[PDB]
Design a protein around this motif. Structure first.
Motif, PDB file in Angstrom:
ATOM      1  N   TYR A 147     -13.037  -0.151   6.140  1.00 46.23           N
ATOM      2  CA  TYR A 147     -11.720   0.345   5.758  1.00 46.23           C
ATOM      3  C   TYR A 147     -10.675  -0.099   6.774  1.00 46.23           C
ATOM      4  N   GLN A 186      -7.461  -8.983  -0.136  1.00 44.81           N
ATOM      5  CA  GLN A 186      -6.763  -9.588  -1.266  1.00 44.81           C
ATOM      6  C   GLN A 186      -5.248  -9.508  -1.107  1.00 44.81           C
ATOM      7  N   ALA A 187      -4.777  -8.430  -0.488  1.00 45.32           N
ATOM      8  CA  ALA A 187      -3.348  -8.231  -0.278  1.00 45.32           C
ATOM      9  C   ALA A 187      -2.805  -9.192   0.776  1.00 45.32           C
ATOM     10  N   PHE A 242       0.795  -1.225   0.000  1.00 49.92           N
ATOM     11  CA  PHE A 242       0.000   0.000   0.000  1.00 49.92           C
ATOM     12  C   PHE A 242       0.832   1.281   0.000  1.00 49.92           C
ATOM     13  N   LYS A 281       0.002   4.892   1.863  1.00 48.94           N
ATOM     14  CA  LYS A 281      -1.429   5.018   2.112  1.00 48.94           C
ATOM     15  C   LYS A 281      -1.752   4.871   3.592  1.00 48.94           C
ATOM     16  N   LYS A 341     -11.687  -4.835   1.032  1.00 49.07           N
ATOM     17  CA  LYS A 341     -11.514  -5.746  -0.095  1.00 49.07           C
ATOM     18  C   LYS A 341     -10.077  -5.705  -0.600  1.00 49.07           C
ATOM     19  N   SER A 342      -9.518  -4.502  -0.666  1.00 45.36           N
ATOM     20  CA  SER A 342      -8.137  -4.325  -1.091  1.00 45.36           C
ATOM     21  C   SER A 342      -7.177  -4.909  -0.061  1.00 45.36           C
ATOM     22  N   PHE A 343      -7.516  -4.747   1.213  1.00 44.49           N
ATOM     23  CA  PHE A 343      -6.695  -5.275   2.295  1.00 44.49           C
ATOM     24  C   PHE A 343      -6.772  -6.797   2.349  1.00 44.49           C
ATOM     25  N   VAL A 391      -7.015   1.929   3.644  1.00 42.04           N
ATOM     26  CA  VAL A 391      -7.340   1.141   2.459  1.00 42.04           C
ATOM     27  C   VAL A 391      -8.668   0.406   2.626  1.00 42.04           C
ATOM     28  N   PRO A 392      -9.380   0.176   1.510  1.00 41.52           N
ATOM     29  CA  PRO A 392     -10.623  -0.604   1.540  1.00 41.52           C
ATOM     30  C   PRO A 392     -10.384  -2.021   2.047  1.00 41.52           C
TER      31      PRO A 392
END
Ligand SMILES: [Ca+2]
Ligand SMILES: [Zn+2]
Ligand SMILES: [Zn+2]
Length: 386
Positions: free
Chosen positions: A189, A161-162, A148, A151, A157-159, A154-155
């Motif tokens: 978030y 998947q990461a 990230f 940042k 969903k983004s977190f 973070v969302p």
């Protein structure tokens, strides 16, 4: 969303935050002074927001373009309107303690507590220090930077998947359960402040999710956020049983655990593991003969496998039960606003209609929780009398 922050919006949040204060000052409620205390947390949030506006007095435009602040003020308004509506629908039930609307007020107070702690951590002395926020654990820090960068937030969903790339997540039920622990502000978030706190609680990083499964999800001793008086109350039953212990999180001291145990004299003492992971303290305490019975149960978990390089699994029934821990059974665990009123077949998962609709309209695959095919649905009533 989230849109930029005008001064007209900040004035709107203040009018809302004040309304909550007036409602909770009602003597018929008689709130608990013990943390979290919403009657103190809100004016502190307000007083700190003025400090933020004080430093960005000459540079207001840059403040409104800050991604974290747009999210925070969005969640602040949503969680405040949620509290106001809670008093509206609850009516007389608010006065009777331990009522389902009253218990939700405690959950919201805990979130408001988490929010102020985050705001002071990202905006120390009213200045944005989010991109330079130092994550305590090294292995956790380098992960965030790689995924990230600078940042602050973070969302989910983004977190998700990461994190999935380093620490595997087998199912959506494990994901929803994971979110319930790490998403403190409950705004879909994930921030550096939240990520820091989580990775401190369930260190080391090498076995992160493997630690969280064995310490929180399937461990009887796990109590989440409790007050010391609440720890004394539960352990009081096992006061004639030396070795009885539970461990909890503290809202006044995030990032660290607090272990309560029963002595041989019949006292309830409380210690804090400082520089060693929780499972390392429980193992050592088990050998010493102090931490013997999780929640008074004779079946204490063997955590010695966590030190080794590699290896356990969790039932989907255990993940679902974990999602119902931090709050009441009435609430839908997706939105945490409306109550359950629909059941999915054949997985048997409960939720509200708005969330199921929002998941289907967003081209989601099957059930919002387990992602299994929906054969049919049936409506349920959660508040049968009221
Ligand atoms: Ca959050
Ligand atoms: Zn919902
Ligand atoms: Zn399902």
């Amino acid at each position: 969303p989230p849109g930029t922050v005008d001064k007209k919006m900040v004035e709107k949040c203040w009018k809302l935050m004040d309304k909550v204060v007036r409602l909770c000052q009602n003597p018929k409620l008689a709130l608990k002074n013990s943390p979290p205390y919403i009657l103190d947390l809100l004016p502190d949030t307000y007083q700190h927001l003025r400090t933020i506006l004080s430093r960005y007095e000459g540079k207001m435009e840059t403040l409104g373009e800050n991604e974290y602040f747009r999210v925070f003020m969005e969640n602040l308004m949503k969680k405040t309107k949620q509290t106001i509506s809670l008093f509206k629908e609850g009516k007389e039930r608010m006065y009777e303690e331990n009522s389902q609307p009253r218990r939700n007020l405690t959950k919201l107070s805990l979130i408001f507590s988490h929010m102020l702690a985050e705001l002071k951590g990202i905006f120390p002395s009213g200045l944005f220090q989010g991109d330079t926020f130092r994550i305590t654990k090294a292995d956790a820090a380098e992960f965030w930077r790689k995924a990230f960068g600078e940042k602050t937030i973070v969302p989910w969903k983004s977190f998700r998947q990461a994190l999935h790339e380093v620490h595997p997540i087998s199912s959506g039920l494990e994901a929803m359960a994971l979110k319930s622990t790490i998403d403190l502000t409950c705004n879909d978030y994930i921030s550096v402040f939240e990520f820091d706190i989580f990775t401190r609680l369930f260190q080391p990083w090498s076995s992160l999710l493997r630690n969280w499964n064995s310490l929180a999800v399937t461990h009887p001793g796990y109590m989440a956020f409790l007050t010391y008086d609440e720890v004394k109350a539960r352990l009081q039953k096992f006061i004639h049983k030396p070795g009885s212990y539970i461990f909890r999180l503290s809202c006044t001291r995030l990032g660290q655990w607090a272990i309560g145990y029963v002595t041989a004299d019949g006292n309830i003492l409380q210690t804090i593991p400082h520089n060693k992971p929780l499972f390392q303290a429980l193992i050592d305490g088990f050998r010493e003969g102090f931490y013997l019975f999780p929640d008074g149960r004779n079946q204490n978990p063997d955590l010695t496998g966590l030190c080794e390089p590699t290896h356990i699994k969790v039932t989907q029934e255990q993940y679902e039960l974990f999602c119902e821990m931090g709050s009441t059974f009435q609430l839908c665990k997706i939105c945490a606003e409306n109550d359950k009123d629909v059941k999915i077949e054949p997985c048997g998962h409960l939720m509200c209609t708005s969330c199921l609709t929002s998941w289907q309209e967003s081209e989601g695959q099957g059930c919002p929780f387990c992602r299994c095919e929906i054969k049919g649905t049936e409506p349920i009533v959660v508040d049968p009398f009221d």
